[model samples]
Target: SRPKVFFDITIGGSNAGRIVMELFADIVPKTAENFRCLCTGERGMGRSGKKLHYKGSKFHRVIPNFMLQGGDFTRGNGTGGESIYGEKFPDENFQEKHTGPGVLSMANAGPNTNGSQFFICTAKTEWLDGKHVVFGRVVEGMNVVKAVESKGSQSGRTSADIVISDCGQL
Candidate 1:
């Protein structure tokens, strides 16, 4: 069975809701495993000396009609993250496409630079196909994703903090 995970979100210090996702392990096992371990934080510390977890990290970038980005558990911004394997890992494959909203994908600096950072597409971001690894998709809580998207500005910043208060496998 595909591994499932979830994130309990908080907006402006208020409990937002939960986002449940199903990883595409059948197509991207390595990429999916990276995200799964990050959610469970079972790997302990990363090579960067930070906890290999997604809890307490803020969604630093949000763009309406675009996506909500986070997983920088190290820096809480858009700049830092570490894969369970190391500081970075290669993309598993580009077999999955960003065909529509609710797609979960890795956020990388460039080619073969995937780490713990990721984003949930709020729209059909076709341009991201093959550029980012699409390892999962939201199975529940599209409303919660929309709520977070509403808080975003054109500059890709949110008016209030959007945090992942808790996360783990489900």
Candidate 2:
């Protein structure tokens, strides 16, 4: 297993931030490399501390643009559950430049717990002040990000209904 996994969330349920995905490429390289395999449905995801895809799976959570946290096969949304830990990655200030809508950032509950979780800013968080790690940005189909953020789920994340289209090296 690698450090982390990259993701391309396809938001189409319901929310303002829909359609695209914020690749975890630049922000969490190790994690991104690992997730790349999962995003492509190419490998087994760690679940209940046990690696298993069982079947090509999708995200079981959603949180709009603020963060549609996912990646952990064990959990969903901001809460990845209590079963598994994907991989831990180093957290850095990054000093990476910022832009408008399309950007991906790492998803960590706190320091050192960054594994299979990340979120993309539907808007911009220049105010984050180089705090969150910069993994990657939406290269294509960013419109997809907005689409997913817009459609949203029925009763919020309670319905664990999100999906990752595909992701890879940039």
Candidate 1 similarity to native, TM-score? 0.98
TM-score of each predicted structure versus truth: 0.98, 0.62
Candidate 2 off by > 4 Å:
1-28, 41-67, 81-87, 153-160, 165-170
lDDT per residue as tens, model 1, 1-170: 99999999999999999999999999999999999999998989999888899998999899999999999988978899999889899988999999899999999999999998998999999998889999999999999999999999888889999999999999
- Model 1 misplaced stretches (Cα beyond 4 Å): none
